[PDB]
Amino acid sequence: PKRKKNPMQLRRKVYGLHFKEKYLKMEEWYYCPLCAEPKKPGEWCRREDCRQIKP
Amino acid sequence: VYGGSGRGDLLYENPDARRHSGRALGVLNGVRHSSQATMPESGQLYYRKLILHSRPPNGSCAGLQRHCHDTCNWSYLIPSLHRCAESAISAKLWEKMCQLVNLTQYERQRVRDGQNLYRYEVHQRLPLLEESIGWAQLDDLLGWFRSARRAWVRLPTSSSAMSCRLEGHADSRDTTPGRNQVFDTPERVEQLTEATVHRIREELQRLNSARRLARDEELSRCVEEELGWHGVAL
Amino acid sequence: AAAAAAAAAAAAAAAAAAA
Amino acid sequence: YFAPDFEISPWIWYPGDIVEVVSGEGIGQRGTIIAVIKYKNEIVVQNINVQDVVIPASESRPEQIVQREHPISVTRVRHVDPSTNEICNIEMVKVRNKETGEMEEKRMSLESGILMSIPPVNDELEVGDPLKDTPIQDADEATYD
Amino acid sequence: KLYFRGGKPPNPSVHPYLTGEPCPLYGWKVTDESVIRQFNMPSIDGTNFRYKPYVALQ
Amino acid sequence: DREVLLTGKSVWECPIHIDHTCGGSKTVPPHAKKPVRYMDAGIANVGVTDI
Amino acid sequence: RYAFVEEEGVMHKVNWGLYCERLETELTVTQERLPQHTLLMKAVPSSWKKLDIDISVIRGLSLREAMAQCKLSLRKGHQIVFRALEMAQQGAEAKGLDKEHLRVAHISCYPGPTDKQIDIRSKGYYAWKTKKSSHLVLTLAEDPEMVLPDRTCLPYSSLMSMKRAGLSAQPTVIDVPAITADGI
Amino acid sequence: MYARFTTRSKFYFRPARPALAYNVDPNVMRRPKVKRGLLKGTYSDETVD
Amino acid sequence: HYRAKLELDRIRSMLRGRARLERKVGLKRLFFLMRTQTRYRVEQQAHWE
Amino acid sequence: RLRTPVRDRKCTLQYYNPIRARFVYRRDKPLFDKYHVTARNLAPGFSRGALKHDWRALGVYTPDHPQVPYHPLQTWMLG
Amino acid sequence: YQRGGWSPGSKHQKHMTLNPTLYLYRFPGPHGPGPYTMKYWWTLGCFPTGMEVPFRLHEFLSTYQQEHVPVEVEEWLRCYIKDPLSELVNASNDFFKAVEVYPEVESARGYKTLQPSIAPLLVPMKKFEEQLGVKISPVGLRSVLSNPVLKDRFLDDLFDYKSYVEKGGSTPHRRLARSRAETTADDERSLILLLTTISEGCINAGNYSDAASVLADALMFCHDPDSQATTHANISFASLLNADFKGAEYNGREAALLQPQVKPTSTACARGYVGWAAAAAYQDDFEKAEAIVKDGLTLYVGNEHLEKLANKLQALREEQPSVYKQVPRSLRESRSHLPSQQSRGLLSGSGKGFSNEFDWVEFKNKLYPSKMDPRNNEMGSVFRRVGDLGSFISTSRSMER
RNA sequence: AUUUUACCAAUUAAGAAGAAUAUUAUAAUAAUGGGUGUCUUAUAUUUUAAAUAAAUAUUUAAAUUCCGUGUAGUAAAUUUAUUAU
RNA sequence: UAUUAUAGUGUAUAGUUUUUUAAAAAUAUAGUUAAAUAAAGUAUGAAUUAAUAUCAAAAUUUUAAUAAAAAUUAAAAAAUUAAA
């Protein structure tokens, strides 16, 4: 709140690592063997088969 | 020539002249020396290269990532000429001329303008057609002849508009390199006509059911009538 | 916001009573 | 056309006349005035300004494209004298008809001196409500003393 | 509240004409009877019943 | 307008009455009348048709 | 009205109307013939600054992976991009392009309409909050040479859980004879 | 690993486009009537609003 | 007061970021650069060379 | 570079990922109702259940712990 | 106090004394109405401030004036509709011309040449579809034209269709008029063959749903028993590839039931049996699949498809002892293994953070927030906070509701 | 077996009546307070007074006076006149 | 659509029904002597401020008043949070 910033001063944040981790991340996924939908490991559906066996 | 009209482009654009602009240029993107503030040295080959290559990719040119268009394809070039002739001469006027010299002054001037536009388009597309002769197709060559007929321009097989070269003393014509100018337009068009006739003959020789029988019959009848109209045989 | 939420809830209850 | 005195005062243009288009899309093409829109100062001439007229589909019929002559600005066309068969300036004139012996207004061609009457308008007359229509005789019955 | 206890104000310029005065015995005693309008139609007649609201077209 | 475009019928008067005053005529007293005006400044009464 | 065009080294006059109509027709037909579908979503409910980040994330990906990432993300920009990708995929299907070879060839946004909302403040002050919107351009081209990673692989935990359940780790692929019209 | 990103000078500084004096385009009579979008390279097979 | 507004806006393309984007900043920087280069040429360049 | 191939990241499930490695030896009996398996997330012979790192028959010396024989993996298991 | 411009569109802060203003909740900006103000426009009928004057003259012109038609014109338009037979003939002619003039793909070496886009074929395709009541897949047409053999097998069929229609035969129209019985005619057979070729192109492309739809339209057109059997077999295969097991099974059963009406030379019956068995296998009923394969073998001993499927089922049976039984009836369909299923999951799958049961819930035809979902009174549901409307207590619990 | 380093770039041609019975001065002829969706009732709807004022004056002298705050009939009903969708 | 029942009269069992979130600092509440509540992140999105080149580690010396102004010497990485 004291002086205007220039494009490079603004781009310092994208240079940093926190910005990349917060915005520029790619999720690893696979097709669920049961519902054949995109799925991230550790998260499942509420379907009975998914609950009983968790892909 | 990069950012402006190129090889087969129809739009005429003088890159140095700031036409088609609503603003007086204040910033010159391609600048090599601070002296170019008052001595841009535009027109010189190297500085003009810098400026033109700094210009962004317009609709004619395409960026390195955008997918370009096969403008050098004969199957696209021929329908372009057909569309040019169709736009120049309306269907009603074409039918009237085919049925029929009693024409209105407006219609006569429309026909003359169409012939002039078709000649200009052929001049612009000539290098691409010449490059695409080799891998063309019989249907597209027949379409070339049909488009010429529709435009009403009789090709110089040796009214007529290609036979007469455009006026202008040889000492004033634009001979600058890098611009696709065809000074020997009638000779080049005659060579192209001979080449396409030979290509049609070769395609028919290579080609040599009810559907295919009818296709062959109609193709032969077309070829015959179109070549007769244009003053060609075989 | 902590005490403000409770204050707003009490105000809403009073408004419902008075409506 | 909502502006006051937007119409043309003399209003020489009436249906059934022959006019030629002097400006616009079609120039030199002449025809008969199919219809006239006086409050817009527009004319509809056969085979002059033909444009498609789309019709949105309904529950009983699908979409259908139909072509009808569209209105043309009055100033674009000029009258054609039948005798001369050329473009002729027209002006409103008044004559006392011999038959009725009463004044009436026609339109005269200056170049050739031709007179053209005003085609009377007779809209559809097949309509009527006999149940609630007073008979003409009883309506005309005079009982006022 | 009397004569206004709501949202839509009354329009005194279209109120029915005053015709009397209150009295606790009967209610509203009517004094100016001529104020009240009676829509007496004309008596029936031949031409009257032959007439119709619209006029035919020649 | 749409009905005319479809049916081809001609219209001789505006389908709706237009009040160009938007109530100014109502505000003006009924007996209003513009005054006479002599020796007015305008070549319109001349009737020229060539200049 | 005539237009000057350089022909045979000299300027030649051609009908200006025909010249312009021919130019526009050629541009439009060339763009249509280009083997790609371009879609424009206007008034996107997302500030262009924020949406640009998700656009950069999704940029340069195949359609399959772009859709997967947008569905697996928790961002307004990613949801908007998923909607845009769905619309562009439908457009490509209608245009005839091959779905399995689709790829994103351009994703960008520029500022669009902007509504303003009043935010009261103490001491009698006030301002106008800005409700921003963006214009999203999404181009789906075709890359026949494109080869996609094999995402059917699943964790060993899932494999052995399915084995315990009795399912088969491999898919039950059954040969499907191609359709034929011999009987006709 | 990470997606390339670059802050846009277009977002940093976006001055309004020049207005028209007397609603006049200076080179309307000199330029073709072609769509500036087409001649600049912006095209859309399906515009959605 | 005259400043090389039109003459320096032309080469304003040779700067970076804010100076290249905003007319005033670029013009001020170019004016300062021209003056400093003139001073250096007229009082130190010959000595160094 | 005209147009580099798609950015689609290669399959990375079978590589080593610390977030998933944190669950290899984590008790998970409540998670499962009817299909329980012994050390579900643990793949014998692999570093923290990463099939891309195989130590089954390489000779790593673990005198007090068991190991399993090397059965060559398959494409549908690796990726 | 005052820092920016006096207008409401100015950004920076203002004060009541200097620049007093009215309470404008939300109004457009300098660049035109935004999505939020337009949502207000469409819902409330005017901008939320209320100081704006609604003006939808352009919308009225677009909708009501365009759809208005007088009674007489509406009555005579149907009578003046174009001639269906001539319009269909013209559509077929132009479609065939466009297909014939469609350029052939150049067989490049070292990479795959991009197939030229089909711009001029869409309008002929659209009119042909409108006339015949069928829907052709643009992807299928593109694949058919790209393939050389399929291109010829499509062109010949189209030419035969044109010839038979020009000869005065319109089998669908004649059948409809008569209904308002006989066997399939040459024109109808040619149309069926054309649709089958389009479906084959769709299958080659990978658009199994389009292939199935085209084959369903062909089945609708056809009336011959042999054509019905062949089309049912094709639809069963298309549905199997598209992951529509119920449809595949139904079509296979219909083909196997039509078996008797077909001559021995045809293989449509065997194809239908194979499709039914494959549908059962995908539904994970190995006993049913084996029984169906046994019946198919008993019917047509020696069929290559039946032998291949029997061998595959034998391999699966040899693998089964590892499980000691078949897949338990509890799941019986859980596992998904088709690329069509994967594509469907990618498209219509419930994404994380949106398009799920917690983002929006679709009521009969309307979108609702998860809290208003009438399918569950979960802890985040408004229905939970209601109770004891006045009739009766209705619940034993005495803490809420 | 595996893989394309980090950083750095730029605004321009505008799609359609989304600009005219428009903005300002200008008419020396009208004029009882203009008020439409108005629409009885008049003890209750009264503004007048010899002055610099909606009426507005062609020059430098002399002259009272502790900074001279200043100039006459031009024609007598003669045309310098408060105009106007 | 805000701290907030406008209470005149008047009455006492109508459940008269909208307040996110998986830690920490700081801040507010909360058996010596004279432990609770407020997170990041998803989403929305202000305000004071703004001469400024991609910036001003540090020390020494000096110039006309704080002097990151000058010179010498020296060696100052990027992002995030907190700290006057």
Ligand code: FES
């Ligand atoms: S089927 Fe994929 S998460 Fe259950």
